Amino acid sequence: DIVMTQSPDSLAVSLGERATINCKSSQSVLYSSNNKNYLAWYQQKPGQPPKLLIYWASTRESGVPDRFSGSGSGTDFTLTISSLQAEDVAVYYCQQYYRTPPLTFGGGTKVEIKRTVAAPSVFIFPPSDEQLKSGTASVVCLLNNFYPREAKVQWKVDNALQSGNSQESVTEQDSKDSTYSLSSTLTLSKADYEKHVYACEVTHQGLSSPVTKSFNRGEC
Amino acid sequence: EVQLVESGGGLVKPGGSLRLSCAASGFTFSNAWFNWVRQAPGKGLEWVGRIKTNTDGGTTDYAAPVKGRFTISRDDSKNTLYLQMNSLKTEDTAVYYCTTGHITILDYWGQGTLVTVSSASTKGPSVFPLAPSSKSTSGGTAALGCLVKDYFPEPVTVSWNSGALTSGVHTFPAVLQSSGLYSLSSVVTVPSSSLGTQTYICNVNHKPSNTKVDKKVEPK
């Protein structure tokens, strides 16, 4: 079986700059009869199937923008995006079709935009009365439209730092403005919620000091 | 234009069976070889199997991990491709793609259908408002949302205003609670002035449990 190995696993490049991704095959995919390399490149955006970009190592698929190009031969190949656009954020896969069963794919390279630092807007949401009737209280903190992806969220209840009772998730990089958003949920019992100020404290590159967003249950 | 529409994915217990379908248009179906490819959540692409045309013997071949358990077939009179999956294992959990391009350059892909193999039972979500307030607004914009709690399996679809509201929406990746159930939030940012006009409703569909919930999201 021909094993395909991609590098790097992720690459961040400024808008309009060059992005290059590497693919190596465990054996040559160049056919000597013709002079063709049996290698293709695909682009996959979130929630979509992969899209064919390049085949025969260097032929662009019909309709693919000119900024996508492929090169290389034998065992080592590269895909180049000559001027990275915000919409090009995607995972890119190489694939060999030289030795069928089985066709094999590389592990993918995530291409991201590098942009200027953007601090998050921080908002907080109290639990609904409807959820409180069920025995649990979820408090939600939202960090909207920030860059880079790394952010620290700390929950405090009556100024006491919490651990082990929150979960968070982060969006994929926005194809338009190249930022991220993050949602963190603090889950407590109704009883615990009723016995105590609820605060989300956010630390992020784009901030000079931590931002704390909070409310008083008494006035929701 | 070529079209490949898949259906048939869902939740199935280990050792169970499932049939996937791929309905085609826009090319001569009887002349096409087809491949199935799968992608486990957050992972790479894995070939599953191939079926030839009847002219080339209609032969099938399969990736080693599914050989003996999966069967590919085609119904040329309905222009539909199938994958019959037997003796299902947890590691078969994936999005399954039908593809075509004959030399194996995968130029056309269906949209994907998710197969989840698990012994846990289906459970529909509870849906709670994330109410806008003085604590969710900055610069003339306000955030509001819905919290979709305690469901199994993935996925849920969250719409706003029955699909009429699309700009400014962030639906976050679900988190897996220690209970084995998923939760997610969907937030939308709107002009603050529109909260004095407009009703905002989140429409939550959890097809595995036949659960649909519409929750009005009012300021607090």
Domain check: are A139 and A217 in the same one?
yes
Of A67, A94, A114, the residue at which a domain comes to its end is: A114
**Which residue's structure tokens are 């090169």?**
A71
Same domain assignment for residues B107 and B2: yes
| CA gap B37, B107 in Å, rounded | 13
Q: Are residues A153 and A170 in the same domain?
A: yes
The span from the CA of A215 to the CA of A192, in Å, is: 16
Based on the fold, state whether residues A122 and A219 are members of the same structural domain.
Answer: yes
Q: How many CB atoms lie within 10 A of CB A25?
A: 25
Same domain for A179 and A159:
yes
Alpha helices in chain A (DSSP H): 129-132, 190-194
Q: Are residues A13 and A84 in the same domain?
A: yes
Rounded Cα distance, B16 and A113, in Å: 43
Residues B128 and B103 in one domain: no
**How many other C-beta atoms are found inside a 10 Å radius of the C-beta of residue A196?**
13
**Distance from C-alpha of B178 to C-alpha of B198, rounded to nearest angstrom:** 37
Taking the C-alpha atoms of residue B146 and residue B203, their distance in angstroms, rounded to an integer, is 9
Chain B window 106-165: which residues touch A at a Cβ cutoff of 8 Å?
A: 106-107, 109-112, 126, 128-131, 133, 135-138, 143, 145, 147, 149
B78 and B163 co-located in one domain: no
Say how many domains are in chain A.
2
Q: Are residues A80 and A122 in the same domain?
A: no
Single residue among A64, A96, A114 that ends a domain in this structure? A114
The reply to whether residue A51 touches residue B105, judged by beta carbons under 8 angstroms, is no
Residues of B in contact with A106 (CB under 8 A): 44
E runs forming strands in A15-159: 19-25, 30-31, 36-37, 39-44, 51-55, 59-60, 68-73, 76-81, 90-96, 104-105, 109-114, 121-125, 136-146, 152-157
Q: Are residues B104 and B197 in the same domain?
A: no
Q: Does B2 reach chain A within 8 Å, measured CB to CB?
A: no
Chain B residues touching A104 at Cβ < 8 A: 47
Instruction: Give the total number of structural domains in chain B.
Output: 2
Question: What is the C-alpha separation between B218 and A39, in angstroms, rounded?
Answer: 54
Q: Which residues pair with B85 in a beta bridge?
A: B18, B70
Q: What are phi and psi of B39, to 5 degrees?
A: -145, 105
* Residue B187 touches chain A, beta carbons under 8 Å: yes
Q: Tell me how the structure was determined.
A: X-ray
Distances (CA, A) of A181 to A56, A122, A138: 39, 10, 19
With CB atoms and an 8 Å threshold, state whether A93 touches B145. Answer: no
CATH of the domain at A95: 2.60.40.10
| Sequence-distant (≥ 6) Cβ neighbours of residue B104 within 8 angstroms | A97, A100, A103, B33, B35, B50
Instruction: Report the b/e string of A167-188 with b at 16+ CB within 10 A.
Output: ebbbbbbbeeebbbbbbbbbbb
State which of B71, B87, B119 marks the end of a domain.
B119
Domain shared by B99 and B38, yes or no: yes
- Residues of chain A with Cβ-Cβ distance to B112 below 8 Å are 49
Alpha-carbon distances of B216 from A139, A176, B128, B146, B154, rounded to whole Å:
18, 29, 9, 9, 23
Q: Are residues B20 and B108 in the same domain?
A: yes
Q: Which chain B residues contact residue A171 at CB under 8 A?
A: 170, 172-173
**φ, ψ at A193 (rounded to 5°):** -60, -40
Distance from CA of B100 to the nearest CA of A (A): 11
The verdict on a CB contact (< 8 Å) between A131 and B50 is no
Residue type, A18: R
Q: Which residues of A touch B105 (CB under 8 A)?
A: 40, 52, 55, 97
Contact call for residues A148 and A126 (beta carbons, < 8 A) = no
- The parent domain of residue B103 ranges over 1-119
CA distances from B3 to A131, B26, B101 (A): 44, 6, 12
How many Cβ pairs closer than 8 A exist between chain A and B?
120
| CATH number for B210 | 2.60.40.10
- Note whether A106 and A4 are same-domain residues: yes
Looking at the structure, tell me whether residues A88 and A186 fall in a common domain: no
C-alpha A203/C-alpha A197 separation (Å) is 19
- B170 in contact with chain A, both atoms CB, cutoff 8 A: yes
Q: Which amino acid is at A56?
A: W
Query: Which amino acid type is present at position B177?
Result: Q
Q: Does B77 touch chain A (CB under 8 A)?
A: no
Structural contact between residues A35 and A73, judged by C-beta atoms closer than 8 angstroms:
no
**Given B126, B135, B147, which is nearest A213 (Cβ)?**
B135
Resolution to 1 decimal, in Å? 1.6
Q: Which token pair is B122?
A: 């289906």
Of all residues in chain B, the one with the smallest CA distance to A170 is: B172
Pick B105's closest partner by Cβ from A50, A55, A107: A55
- Decide which of A55, A81, A114 is a domain's last residue: A114
> How far apart are the CA of A20 and the nearest CA of chain B, in angstroms?
20
CA B189 from centroid of its chain's CA atoms: 25
Domain span at residue A135 reads 115-220
Distance (Å, rounded) from C-alpha B38 to C-alpha A69?
26
Residue type (1 letter), B213: V
Last residue of a domain, one of B84, B119, B154: B119
Q: Are residues A89 and A152 in the same domain?
A: no
Among B98, B105, B171, the residue to mutate for chain A (most A Cβ within 10 A): B105
Q: Cβ of B175 under 8 Å from any chain A Cβ? A: yes
